[PDB]
Amino acid sequence: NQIDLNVTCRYAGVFHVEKNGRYSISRTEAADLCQAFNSTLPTMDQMKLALSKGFETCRYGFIEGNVVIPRIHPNAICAANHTGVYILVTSNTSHYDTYCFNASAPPEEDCTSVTDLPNSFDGPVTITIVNRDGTRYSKKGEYRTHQEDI
């Protein structure tokens, strides 16, 4: 009973979370997952400021109201070579990664590791936070509040 959460650097408190190495998070699960990180889905403004501080990914993830990819460098296989906060317009499907925003994080680039899931609750799942540098933090718990996500 395991969940792997790959996380990134935080940029102005915004970071990316990929669950189990594939697009697998619903919008309801994304809100609960960010809440477990004492975080919320970023607003478009928060994500734009994170982008300006150096944040980019090559993965679709939820923010408040939209599914986006923050891009700094044009890359043909990432958001069709666009720069800026690329907004997903047309998709058949509902599961993506998520972005989260933690207000207590540093104001600019914070590429230290994530070392806790501070607001997870009691539960049976071994949840492992996996940093980009491979460092891991594991705890037993749960963060999903909607049955349809379990």
Ligand SMILES: O=C(N[C@@H]1CCCNC1)c1ccccc1
């Ligand atoms: O673990 C986190 N931050 C660490 C704290 C110690 C120093 N470096 C980052 C964290 C938790 C929840 C959301 C975002 C980040």
